[PDB]
Each structure stands twice: as structure tokens, then as C-alpha cells.
Amino acid sequence: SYDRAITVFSPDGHLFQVEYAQEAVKKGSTAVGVRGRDIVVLGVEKKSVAKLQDERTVRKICALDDNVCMAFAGLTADARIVINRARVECQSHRLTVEDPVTVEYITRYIASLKQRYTQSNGRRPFGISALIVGFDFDGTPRLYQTDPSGTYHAWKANAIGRGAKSVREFLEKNYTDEAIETDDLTIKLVIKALLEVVQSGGKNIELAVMRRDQSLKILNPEEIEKYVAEIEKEKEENE
Amino acid sequence: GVILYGPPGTGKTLLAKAVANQTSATFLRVVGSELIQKYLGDGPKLVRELFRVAEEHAPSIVFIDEIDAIGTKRYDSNSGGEREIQRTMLELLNQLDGFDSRGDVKVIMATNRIETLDPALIRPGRIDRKIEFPLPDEKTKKRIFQIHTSRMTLADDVTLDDLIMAKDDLSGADIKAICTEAGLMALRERRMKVTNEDFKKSKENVLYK
Amino acid sequence: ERGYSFSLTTFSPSGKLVQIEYALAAVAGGAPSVGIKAANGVVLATEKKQKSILYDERSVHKVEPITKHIGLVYSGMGPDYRVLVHRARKLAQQYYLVYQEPIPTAQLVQRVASVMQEYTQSGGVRPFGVSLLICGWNEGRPYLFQSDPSGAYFAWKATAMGKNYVNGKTFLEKRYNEDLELEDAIHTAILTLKESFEGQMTEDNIEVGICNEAGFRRLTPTEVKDYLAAIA
Amino acid sequence: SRRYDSRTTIFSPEGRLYQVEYAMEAIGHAGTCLGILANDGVLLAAERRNIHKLLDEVFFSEKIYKLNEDMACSVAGITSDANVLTNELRLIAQRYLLQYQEPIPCEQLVTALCDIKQAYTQFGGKRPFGVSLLYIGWDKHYGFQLYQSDPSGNYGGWKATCIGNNSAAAVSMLKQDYKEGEMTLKSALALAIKVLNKTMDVSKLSAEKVEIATLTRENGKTVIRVLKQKEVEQLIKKHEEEEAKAEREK
Amino acid sequence: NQYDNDVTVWSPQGRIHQIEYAMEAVKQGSATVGLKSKTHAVLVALKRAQSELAAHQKKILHVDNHIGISIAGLTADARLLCNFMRQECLDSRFVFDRPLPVSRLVSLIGSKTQIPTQRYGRRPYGVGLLIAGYDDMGPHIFQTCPSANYFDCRAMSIGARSQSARTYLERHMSEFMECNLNELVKHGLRALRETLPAEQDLTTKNVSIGIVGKDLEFTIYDDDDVSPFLEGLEERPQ
Amino acid sequence: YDRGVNTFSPEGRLFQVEYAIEAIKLGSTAIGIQTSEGVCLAVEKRITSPLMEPSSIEKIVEIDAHIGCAMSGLIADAKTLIDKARVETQNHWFTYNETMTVESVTQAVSNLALQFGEEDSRPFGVALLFGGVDEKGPQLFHMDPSGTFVQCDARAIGSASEGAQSSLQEVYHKSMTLKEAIKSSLIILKQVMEEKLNATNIELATVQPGQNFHMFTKEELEEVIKDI
Amino acid sequence: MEYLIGIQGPDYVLVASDRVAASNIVQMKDDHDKMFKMSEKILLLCVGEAGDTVQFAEYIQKNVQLYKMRNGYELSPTAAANFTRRNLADCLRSRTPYHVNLLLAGYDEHEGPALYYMDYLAALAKAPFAAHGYGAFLTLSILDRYYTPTISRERAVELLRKCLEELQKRFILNLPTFSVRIIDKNGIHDLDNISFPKQ
Numbered sequence A: 001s002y003d004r005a006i007t008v009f010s011p012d013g014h015l016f017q018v019e020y021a022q023e024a025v026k027k028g029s030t031a032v033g034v035r036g037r038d039i040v041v042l043g044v045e046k047k048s049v050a051k052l053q054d055e056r057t058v059r060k061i062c063a064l065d066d067n068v069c070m071a072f073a074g075l076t077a078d079a080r081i082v083i084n085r086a087r088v089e090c091q092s093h094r095l096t097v098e099d100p101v102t103v104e105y106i107t108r109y110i111a112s113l114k115q116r117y118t119q120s121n122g123r124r125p126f127g128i129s130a131l132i133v134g135f136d137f138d139g140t141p142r143l144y145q146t147d148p149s150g151t152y153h154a155w156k157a158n159a160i161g162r163g164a165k166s167v168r169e170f171l172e173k174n175y176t177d178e179a180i181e182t183d184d185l186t187i188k189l190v191i192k193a194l195l196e197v198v199q200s201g202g203k204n205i206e207l208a209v210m211r212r213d214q215s216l217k218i219l220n221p222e223e224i225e226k227y228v229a230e231i232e233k234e235k236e237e238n239e
Numbered sequence B: 001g002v003i004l005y006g007p008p009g010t011g012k013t014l015l016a017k018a019v020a021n022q023t024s025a026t027f028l029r030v031v032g033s034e035l036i037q038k039y040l041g042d043g044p045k046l047v048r049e050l051f052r053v054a055e056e057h058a059p060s061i062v063f064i065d066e067i068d069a070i071g072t073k074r075y076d077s078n079s080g081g082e083r084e085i086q087r088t089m090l091e092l093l094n095q096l097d098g099f100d101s102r103g104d105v106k107v108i109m110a111t112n113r114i115e116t117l118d119p120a121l122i123r124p125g126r127i128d129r130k131i132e133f134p135l136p137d138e139k140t141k142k143r144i145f146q147i148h149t150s151r152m153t154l155a156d157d158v159t160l161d162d163l164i165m166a167k168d169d170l171s172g173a174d175i176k177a178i179c180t181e182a183g184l185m186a187l188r189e190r191r192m193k194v195t196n197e198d199f200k201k202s203k204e205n206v207l208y209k
Numbered sequence C: 001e002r003g004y005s006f007s008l009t010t011f012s013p014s015g016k017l018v019q020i021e022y023a024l025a026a027v028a029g030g031a032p033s034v035g036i037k038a039a040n041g042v043v044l045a046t047e048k049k050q051k052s053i054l055y056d057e058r059s060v061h062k063v064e065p066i067t068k069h070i071g072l073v074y075s076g077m078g079p080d081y082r083v084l085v086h087r088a089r090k091l092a093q094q095y096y097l098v099y100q101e102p103i104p105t106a107q108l109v110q111r112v113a114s115v116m117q118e119y120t121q122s123g124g125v126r127p128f129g130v131s132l133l134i135c136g137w138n139e140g141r142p143y144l145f146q147s148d149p150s151g152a153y154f155a156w157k158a159t160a161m162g163k164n165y166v167n168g169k170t171f172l173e174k175r176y177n178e179d180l181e182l183e184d185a186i187h188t189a190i191l192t193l194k195e196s197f198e199g200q201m202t203e204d205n206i207e208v209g210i211c212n213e214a215g216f217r218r219l220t221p222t223e224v225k226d227y228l229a230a231i232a
Numbered sequence D: 001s002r003r004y005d006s007r008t009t010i011f012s013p014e015g016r017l018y019q020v021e022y023a024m025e026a027i028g029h030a031g032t033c034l035g036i037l038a039n040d041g042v043l044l045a046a047e048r049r050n051i052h053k054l055l056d057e058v059f060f061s062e063k064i065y066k067l068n069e070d071m072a073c074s075v076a077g078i079t080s081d082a083n084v085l086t087n088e089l090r091l092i093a094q095r096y097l098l099q100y101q102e103p104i105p106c107e108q109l110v111t112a113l114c115d116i117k118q119a120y121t122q123f124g125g126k127r128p129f130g131v132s133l134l135y136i137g138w139d140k141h142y143g144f145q146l147y148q149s150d151p152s153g154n155y156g157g158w159k160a161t162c163i164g165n166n167s168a169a170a171v172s173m174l175k176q177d178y179k180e181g182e183m184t185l186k187s188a189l190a191l192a193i194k195v196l197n198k199t200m201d202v203s204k205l206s207a208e209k210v211e212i213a214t215l216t217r218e219n220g221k222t223v224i225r226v227l228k229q230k231e232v233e234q235l236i237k238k239h240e241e242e243e244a245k246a247e248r249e250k
Numbered sequence E: 001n002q003y004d005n006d007v008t009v010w011s012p013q014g015r016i017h018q019i020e021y022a023m024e025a026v027k028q029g030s031a032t033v034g035l036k037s038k039t040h041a042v043l044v045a046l047k048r049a050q051s052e053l054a055a056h057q058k059k060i061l062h063v064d065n066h067i068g069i070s071i072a073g074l075t076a077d078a079r080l081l082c083n084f085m086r087q088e089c090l091d092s093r094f095v096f097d098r099p100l101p102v103s104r105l106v107s108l109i110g111s112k113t114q115i116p117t118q119r120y121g122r123r124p125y126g127v128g129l130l131i132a133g134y135d136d137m138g139p140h141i142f143q144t145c146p147s148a149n150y151f152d153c154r155a156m157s158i159g160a161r162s163q164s165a166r167t168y169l170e171r172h173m174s175e176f177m178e179c180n181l182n183e184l185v186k187h188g189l190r191a192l193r194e195t196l197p198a199e200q201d202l203t204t205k206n207v208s209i210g211i212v213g214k215d216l217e218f219t220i221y222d223d224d225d226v227s228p229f230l231e232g233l234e235e236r237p238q
Numbered sequence F: 001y002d003r004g005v006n007t008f009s010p011e012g013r014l015f016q017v018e019y020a021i022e023a024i025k026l027g028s029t030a031i032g033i034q035t036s037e038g039v040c041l042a043v044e045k046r047i048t049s050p051l052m053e054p055s056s057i058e059k060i061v062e063i064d065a066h067i068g069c070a071m072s073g074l075i076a077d078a079k080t081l082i083d084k085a086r087v088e089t090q091n092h093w094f095t096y097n098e099t100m101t102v103e104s105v106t107q108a109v110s111n112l113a114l115q116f117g118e119e120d121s122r123p124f125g126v127a128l129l130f131g132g133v134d135e136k137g138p139q140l141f142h143m144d145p146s147g148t149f150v151q152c153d154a155r156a157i158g159s160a161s162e163g164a165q166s167s168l169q170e171v172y173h174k175s176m177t178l179k180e181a182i183k184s185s186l187i188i189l190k191q192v193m194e195e196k197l198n199a200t201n202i203e204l205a206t207v208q209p210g211q212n213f214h215m216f217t218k219e220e221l222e223e224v225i226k227d228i
Numbered sequence G: 001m002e003y004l005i006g007i008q009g010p011d012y013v014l015v016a017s018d019r020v021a022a023s024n025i026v027q028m029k030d031d032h033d034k035m036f037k038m039s040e041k042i043l044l045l046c047v048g049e050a051g052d053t054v055q056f057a058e059y060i061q062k063n064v065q066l067y068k069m070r071n072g073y074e075l076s077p078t079a080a081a082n083f084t085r086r087n088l089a090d091c092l093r094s095r096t097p098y099h100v101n102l103l104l105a106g107y108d109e110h111e112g113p114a115l116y117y118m119d120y121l122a123a124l125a126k127a128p129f130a131a132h133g134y135g136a137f138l139t140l141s142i143l144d145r146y147y148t149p150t151i152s153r154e155r156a157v158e159l160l161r162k163c164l165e166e167l168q169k170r171f172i173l174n175l176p177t178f179s180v181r182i183i184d185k186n187g188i189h190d191l192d193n194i195s196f197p198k199q
């Protein structure tokens, strides 16, 4: 057994292996999510496809239950083992207390798994950040995120990945109340958001909405070809 | 102080020429590899007389390029080992923020391995501005092809947008490395315009080896 | 007590495992040894010089049998060899207690080289400093395999290990063909060990072991003197 | 004892980690493997390295390893590290068959091994594997599949990929000559001999220098056929006949 | 100094520096003075605080009905040996049905704290135990140190500025083996006014006294019942 | 160059215990005041973004029905100590059929605070206030990353800790009431925080002898603010 | 002790069980449910002692729901039934063997409908019809009397009607009510809770 303290304090009060892992998040591909009052909409950008690969084994939006979706950034090898440990826990909740898992509960499991893992012996911390999105019982759509140090944190709109400060500055000057008016109008905010990011001009973006009673339903590159037309068409006439 | 860092071939040396184009100051350049000497103490003597030259002329600009090379590569000419590299850097650490009256001397530095060198040299007071250079973005890439193919009689066969995403992280240096090479293939056949198959065999020659 | 539980063998920034590259230097400074298979059996021949006249040459042996039909020589350092001999003696028994059959020579090298790879990754250990040559005649056809401290293995027709191994491989390439008997391969194994020995190659400076379909055995110095006679 | 510890698990101050990038640096050199599919069948084209004139040429394969009764793998990197992985997911497929009495799907065999490979990069103070490898196979859920593993622990589905020494040159030409769902298992073979004509610096394409194995679906068989050295060279010269025709007529 | 890192490493002079640095930790805590008569064992502590509204940190603890201790150093390792101290007293009372003798208790501590002073990656216990108790042989004053070396003594003082208290105890210890409980205590109280700056001494909220006695169970006096003992002292001469 | 985690200084303290004392100077500030009428206890939130939901974060959390808490420094490892305190108060109720006192909760946590090493891995970088009403009335305790706890009367912990303590020693006296202790704390928090004071940047909680642990919410809270 | 039945047709599986949760001599609950879903086309019908029928059958249910989330598709009825047989057989030679009797019913899009049979010794059996409990001794003889491999689902219900009326003539237990399912290409469907009025 390898017993060595990896994460230790700095002489001024930092945890260096934590904040080095935050920079591995800061060059993964961008993931943006907002919530509507009835339909949540989150979609990663930079699919970065090379037209010789299977398109389904590269997906970064998975589901933990029927109601809880999840996107991430950072490095993918650490991601899909946190996900598989979350799938066991949200299934073991049902053998216990009968209701399906509330979206706040599954964030506390991931965040507490991630903290104690910056505390044990001989373990580097995880290098991912996540967005947990779900519409729980009694239909209240909400989302969260998870820092690699393990601080779960709710939001109304957020973005992580490479180029996340510029998108977060873009949303606050754009997030109104009437932006979440229609289920097709909230999507026009996300498609306007990631187009203000690394280019992804309809060819590298994959939105995925959830209408509070469905599962995840990814629109194929025909409505995004339709939406990016009309989002740029309104931009064509006003300016 | 101003330092410039980033991956190799992104335009660190390219930007310093634009400053020396523009300025009316006297402009001094030295490479970091030639700071190390074969005799003992000839290193720190060379630094002291550099800033003597820079101060005695004018408002002046001292450009020191590739300063990570003072600490990475060990050479058998240097009789003092790593503890002659060290004594030179202590003199360089003096000449940026000594107690002497400095005068009007601006210092520009550039490297591509920013994590290797001494953090005492990058403290505020010696270098204030720290400028990162990223890789060229794919809409800034198209601008670079517009520059290096400006004054060439480019035939209308070619499509530049296929050339852009060829390497996913091709630097600005690679673009000039292709555009200069494709012109060299045309002079093998005495032609005046550059066709598409020039570029098709160009990236095989430049990138893939 | 306890161990270290961390690998002291890491990747270089040039992408090379440096400790394995150093272990091959200790193999190359060993005693020279050649091995030749030819169409009815395998010949293993090594070079054993005592440092002085005080040593008892009939006490230790370079050529060792593993079972009825598998022999094994080395070229490296001494005390590492006796460890993985006693390991390979045991591995041939757990195959036999399960299957009631002598082990194939291929499946032994599957399991001996798995020990050497496991030993260059685990915590707190330096790799072995020996390379092996393994013979045997399973199901008529003979076999000749060579392992290395990294844990790989090969299937040679004829090869040399030890000092001046790059000269022996050029010598065997100009000598070996498909069609030889066992007594011809003995004569050309002495002819390639004479490239690097001293002036006197007596009946006790070398050590030769053979396989047949009758099984592995090791030559006594009586007939080794007869093979050393009328040689070169 | 903490003076001798090399800390093969920690991050670097720039954010990335050095140890697996040194391994993927070593995965570039020493080997060449590629695969292709568009229709019924899938192939693995691999180039032999040790072509010395004194070897026995046995064990039915050199870098091809049959894993299940209907899937196989081609490996690249440290060969000794490869022998531990190959007989590790060989019994992952068998403990699946013990548990469900059904052959394992080709995708979740890859995810099972790439979790073992990911764990050494993450804790234990242990040297990771410098091994990347391909996966062909068939299952009833999706048919012919093609995967690729990395030493970091992340996999991916593909259609044609090379992990050779000039693998970037091969991929750049695979996405120059390709067709989605129309490359039958003769045009892919002619395309396979075309690609390793380029990336192999040893010219003239010695038939003993390469190995090609095909996986075709026969009704209850899924025949994995390592094609012999008598039909390689006629496929070699078939590439040679058309290239003298195409050069002279252009 | 590369010989200055781990407890295992000997110095070339032969003095392990990690043990010598734990002696610096006991010199940081406030002073305390223990002494004994023929029939009594009295230890007196001096508390400290952080602000004027925060409470004062206690130092005298109750181990058993005939054993009490006083700590100096970091308080977390003090409770680690205190919970070991209480456990070793009541199981001997569970097995043999007798009070565990004091001189046999301290040798269990000396074997307890010597173990992490020899392994790898194990700190010493920075603590300043003054022990007062009863055998069948009368009172006993024992002190320990992080070098796992316990001392039999008749009056000692440890903590910050304790050398001035030791000079007072040497020139008055001929009187200690005769007096009753009253001026035995205020002999020790004149040692704590020695180890202070010349303006504040004994303001009834920073001092504590613990006595075990020949027919008296170990009793701690805190900040109100100190005042009968504390009255009857003369002014500081200047 | 690299020491172990368990090394004394030449001045004798430690290295990483003393480094963790520095880490709680980056956390948000928090004020607790003990009054004989009851314990009031407040904090700021340090809201970063307008898009952020404000109530998802918390600093006041309850341990039992009569004991509240307040955390500073890091947050993610504070939740480990909170869960050990909640379990400890329920094991004491299960085995003794009573309520664990406020002091004995604190030493049950403070024994856990210094247990790292290389067997069986770093000290916790939080600082806690424990407000509660046991049978000795209202109590107020303060622990350390070093595991040292002491009863305080008006303790201010966070990035503005030493600036607030000086302004808090002048207004506190032993005969306060709870209605003026609540008002006196928000005068101090109005000075030290960055943004303006409203009903969303801060939150309070008071524990009484009569009723149990009560946390204020955004309806009864702003009558203190508009009548500051 | 209590009864369930397994008629399997060409493109459907008709299953039914009782609804009585028993006690010493009384019946605690008259509308109990012995039916456990795992997928959209796989059921589970468990009979045995008190604790093991509840906890084993929901242990299997959390492993089948987990397989669908990790992969995106469901188990076949062949593989789902054969995963259960490994779990009894491994826990058989233990300190706590489960004592349950069960039969699993499933539909697949490749091999059509399927019915499997198990006991408390974990022996599989691919059967066209099966039954557990003491009512199996009474009711198997009617069922092979009238079984056709090509039987329509309308007359398969009235065969089950005939198979239960004899169970309320010569069987000493009470058993008034019976809950009925049906499985097809469209998934699980609830049929009429057939019963006999004791008024």
C-alpha cells in the first residue's frame, strides 16, 4: 500500500495539487448550461469531429437516472469513473427511500466523494468540473456545478471549460427574464452563447434539451442548422 | 518589465521586430544562449557592460530573447558548472532592480519554457507585465494565410479553408513554412502561379516527417 | 518490516525506461554463450572460466535442467540466475499437478517472462540482470527461445548472448542453415565460442547441453573432450 | 524513504501530468498498426519490426491477439507490458460469459480494461502502462466495431485509425481516400496496402514485413482469419500494377 | 542543515534535532510550579488568554482521586496522553482493585512516548507533564519531557521563563519538608510572582492550585476558592 | 527540500498546522456574540456572480436542535466535521437519553482535528464557532485547525477577523440584550464587507433558552436592516 | 404454499399469481403483489419464505436497472434469467442461503417470448408452461390437457379461467383473487384482476 501525503498545504495557505487540477479543467472543451422555467437546455461545444470516428462514443452528456443529466470538462478518463460511481449511488437510493433521487442529493454525493479524495493518502485529486442538471419532483428545474476541490454550488446560468470567463461575462449582460420565455427561445440563448465562444459554427456544437418529463433528446444537426440560421437572421436585420 | 511567453513559433520574436520598426529609441538585442562564457567570471562581466552600454546611449530598449536557455542546456565549454550559471543570474538579478539609479531603460524578455527559470527574476519590480501567447485560433489562422499569400500570384484553383484545419494546432510559423515551400516547388517547373497540388505535396514535405 | 511500494523505474522524457536500458548493459558484459537448434535437437553451449586454479569446476553449473526435457542457460550476473531457476522449477510443477503432463516449452516462457515483467514494474526493486536461452523438444519439433530483462521473448533459430554477441550473430548467419544434425550443431557451437575465448579451450572451460526426443541432458567432460578434439 | 520517491501520480504546475505524456511519447515510435471497415468485415494491418534472418516465425501471429471467440486486438508499445494486458481482458470476457452465458459486447470489454489502465495513472505510486491498442470485433447490437485505447485510459470509436510512427501521415491520407459504407473488403485491402506503402520507409513492401488479419461474419462462426504469406505478395503487386498505370497515364 | 529533517536521522555530533525542537515547544507555554512536603503535593499553574473577553485556558487536569497532572505545550497532544493516562489508572483498578502507584504509572508513559521517537515519519509528543500523586510512600513530584526521559524531583518548574522560578526554589527548599498546607502553597505562589513582569501578578482569574493530601482527595481550586489561598502575600519589593 | 507533514520547526511549533492557520484568513468573515438572553451568530456570504443562486451556499448550519455552527476558511472539508458532530450528539442521546452539552460537543470534534499522518493526511483548514444553550445557559466556543478550543464571549473569525475584534471589544458588555446584540453585529459587518448590506448577502441565527435553534430568513431579517 | 402460473404463447407470455399475504392462520393482506418489474419486457415472480422473497428479488432489480444505465440497452430475458441463477448458486453454499422459488417471464425482439423456471436449488428450465406452490399439483394436469403451441391470447385467458376454477374446488386453502399480466412487443400490460365473489 502506497502511503504518502500528496495534497499538502503551501507556506501561504494554498493546496497546490488542487489548484493545479483546476487548470486541467481550464483547457477542456466548453460546456454551457442555462435553465428555463419548464425546459432545461445545456449543450457542450467543440465536438472537434474528424469525420472518421463513431459519433456516439465521443459524447460528453450522459444520464445518471431518467431525470438527471450531466455534462463535464477536464480530462475524460477521470470523468467516466466518477459517473459510474454516481450511477451506483443513485440506484442504491432507490433500494432505500422509495422516491427517485433529487438533483441536490446527487451533487452532494459527487462533491463529498471529491473532497475526501483530496484528503486521503497517495491520491492526486480529480481534474474535472461538472454540470448536474435535472427537473426534480414537483417540477422545479435547477442546476449545479462542482469545483475539483468539491464545493457544490447552484446557478441560474453557467459555463465551464476553455473560454469560460468570456462566456460567463456574456451571459450576465444577456440573461433576462423573457429570455426563458419560450422553450425554443431559451435555446436561442445557448446557441448565441457558444457562438460567442470558440467558433463551432453549427458543426461542432451539440445541444441537448430536457422538457421536465422526457429523457434527454439530442437534436440532430438539422435544427441547429435551422436555429443558427434564424439566430443569425435576426442579427442580420437589426445591425 | 515585460515578458513574452507561449509555445514555440507563435510570434514572440515576430512582435519584437514590430517594436524596433516603430520606436525612435536605441534597440539592443542579445540571445540567452550567448550569456554563458568559457572562462570563470566572464559571464557576469558581460552583463555589467551590457547595461552600461544601454544606459550610456539614450532612452533604450533591451531585448533578451530565449532566456530559458541559460539554465536548460549544459555545455562543456563552461568551466564553472551550474554554479557559474548561478552567479551570472545573480548579476542579472541585480541589473534589473538594483539600488543604483537606473535611468530610462526598458526591458523586454521572451521565452517558451516559462516554468523553468527562477521565480525571483519574475517578481514585480523586475518584470511587471506577463503576456501569454496562445496558439492561433482557426479564424485567426485564415488571417495569417491572407498575409503570407498577399503578394504572390496565387492561382484560383486553391481553397485555403481546407489548408486551415490540416494540423489541428499548426502555429503561425507553420503557415509561412508551407507558403514559402509551395513557391519553391513552382520554380522547379519554372511556373509563375501556384496550383493546388503544390500545396498538396507541401504539407507532406513540411509537417509529415 | 515492510517495503517501499513505489516504482523506481519511470519513463524518461525521451520515452525510454532507463533502468531496463542499464540492465541490458550488465547482460552484455557477461560470459558469452550461443544456442543452436537444428532439425532434431537444440545445442546450448556456454563459456565457463574459473579465475584461478583453486576453484572446483565440478561444483556449480551454468547449464541447468528444468524438467525431463527443458534446459536453460544464461548470460548475465550469477546470483540473479539462481532465483529465477528455482522459480521456473516450481512453475513447471504447478502445470504438472493440474494437467498431468510435461509443460510445453512455449508455455514455460509465457510464465517465466511474466515474472520478469512483473518484477520491473512493482515497488522498490531493480530489474533482473540476466538473459536466458531455453531449449526443449515438445511434440517432435524442437524449440529455442530467448528472454530479456524487460520481459519480452523471441523464437530464434540460432543466436548468441554475452560479450561479442554482435560478432557471433554475424558468424552464425554465415554458418547455419536449415539442414544439420545434432552433432553438426555441436561442432559449429564450439567453432563460434572459439571466437571469444582464451587460447586454451579445454574440457572444463566450456559446458554443453543438448536436447533430443530422448530428453534434455548435459554432457560430461569425457565426450566434451572428444568434441573439443578435432575442432576448428 | 521519502527522498527516493519519484511521485509518478502528482500534477504539474501547468496543469497537465507528465508521466502519461512520456508514455504516449514512447507510443509513437516502435510499431505500426491500423484498421479499416465500411461493410461486412474488418481488418487489422500491422507492420513487423524485427525482420532478422534468424527467427522461427511461429505462434500464428506477432501483434495480433485473439481475445474472445469473436474479437481480437492489435497492440503497440512495450511488448512486455502488452502480455499482461492481453491475458487480463482475455478472462474479463470469460468471467462475463460465466455470469451471463452470452458473448461480451465489444464496447464494454474496452471500458473494463480502460478502467484498470486508468487506475495506475491516478493512485498507487506506480508506473503506468505505455501501451495503446486497437480492437476489432462483432456483436449483435451494432455489428462490426472498431475501437482505440490510449495509455491515459480513454477510448474511442473509429472507422480507420493508425498508431504508427508516421500515424499522423496515415490519418491525413485516410481522410483523403475513404467512403462511408461502400469500402468492401477488397477495396479496403487495396487501400491498406496503399497506406503502409507510404508510412513504411523500408520501400518495395516486403510481404514478410507486414501482417494482415481479417474478421468476417460467417453465420455462427465470426471467422478471424490471419491471411498467409502466399496471398500477401499478389496483393502487393496488384498495388504495383495500378500505380505504374496511373502515373504514366497522367 | 540536512540532518534536521526526520527523527530517524542522527546528527554527526550525535544529537537528534527533532527531539531538541520539541523542547522548544514546551518552552512556549506558560509557567507552572510543583513542589511537595512530607505529606502533601501541591502544583500551581498560571493561565493565559488571547483577548480580555475570551476565557483562560486551563492546565490542571484530574487523572484519578490521587493523581493529577499539569500540562505545557500544545493542548491536543496533552489530551492524547491524558486519555491514555485515565485509561491506565482505572483498568488497574478494574483488575487488581487498588490505586495504581505513581512511579509505576510514569514508566508506562516513558515507554509510550519513546516509540514515536524512533520510527519514520512520527513526531514526538510536545508536552510538559508535571505529575503529583500518592504511592504508599507519600507524595511524589515527577516531570517528563518530549525526549521520553522522566525525572524524579522534589520541586520543579517548566514553561516560559522558568529559570527564574528554579532559583527561588533552590534557596527555600530547606523549609519545604516541615510546613503545613498553608505556607507550602504560598511558598509556591512566591515562585509564580518571580516569573512575571513587574506590574501584574496574581489577579485571581489566571492562577489555579491543585492539592492531593494524606487524607485529602485531589482537588482543583479555580478563581474563587483561590482567593483564600491568595490572600496573605506581601507586596512585591522594588 | 521537501519535509514530511509531521516536522517541528526550529522555533518549535509545526509546519502545516501553522500553515493552516493562514488558510482561514481567506475565508468570509463571521461574528458570534454570547449574551445571557441568548447567542446571536452572523456571517456574510461573499456573492460572486449575479447569475449565482444566493441561498444554495450556507455558513450557519445546525448540529442539533439547540446547537448551531458557523464555518470559515474552506468549506468543502468543513462538512466532514459537521457530520461527525451530528452523529456524536445522537450517540450521546441514544446511550444516555439526554442532550450533549455544548462544551462536550467541541472536544469531541477537537480530538479529530489533529490526527493526520502516514499510517492507518493533512490538518483541516476550517475554523468553527459553536453557539448553543445547554443547562449552564448560552455558550459560545471557538476551535482551531490546531484543535485548541476556548470559550469566547464575542469572537470574530474570517478575513476581517482582527479588524472586527477591535471594534467589538469597545461595544460589548456583560449585560447586553439579544435585541441590541443583533443590531451591534450588523453594524460591524456593514463596515468590513465589500458589497452593500441587504437581505441576501448575510444571514443570521439565534438560539434561545426558551425556543430551539432558529435561523432567520429574508422576511424577518430586513426589519433589522431598515432600522439599523 | 401459494400459487403462480406461466402460460406462454407464440408471441406473448401470460402470467398470473395470487394476492394473499398469509400469516399463522389468518391472512394479513388480501391484495398483495408478487410481481416485480425489471425492464419494459421482463417480469419476475418470486415465492418462498418471509425475508428472502423481498430482498433477493429487489437485489436483482437494482442490478438490471444498473445494466441499462451503464450501456443504454436492456438485458435479454435469457441473460437476465441466467444472471439470477449465478446469484443463488454462489450464495447456496454460504452461511445464509436464500430459500426462494421463482419463474421469470420475458419478451425479446430477437427470439420472441421466453419463460424460465427455477427453484431454491437454482436449476434453470426453458418451459412452455410452469407453476409453483401446492396448486401446481392440481393445475398442471388441466394445462397440458389443453395446451396447443399455437394458442391465441383470448382463449389462453379462458384456459387460465378454467385452470383456476378447479383450484377453488379441490384445494383446501382460500385464495379468492388473482392478478394477471401479459407481455408482448408493446411491453407489460395489466389485465383484469380476476376473482371469485365470496359474498
Ligand SMILES: Nc1ncnc2c1ncn2[C@@H]1O[C@H](COP(=O)(O)OP(=O)(O)OP(=O)(O)O)[C@@H](O)[C@H]1O
Binding pocket: B007, B008, B009, B010, B011, B012, B013, B014, B015, B112, B136, B144, B147, B171, B172, B173, B174, B176
Ligand atoms: N500570429 C502570427 N501572424 C503572422 N505570422 C506569424 C504568426 N506567428 C508566427 N508567424 C510567422 O512565424 C515566423 C516565426 O515566428 P517567431 O519566431 O516570432 O515565433 P516565436 O514564438 O518567436 O518562435 P520561438 O519560440 O522559436 O522563438 C515569423 O516570421 C512569422 O512570419
Ligand SMILES: [Mg+2]
Binding pocket: B009, B012, B013, B014
Ligand atoms: Mg522566435
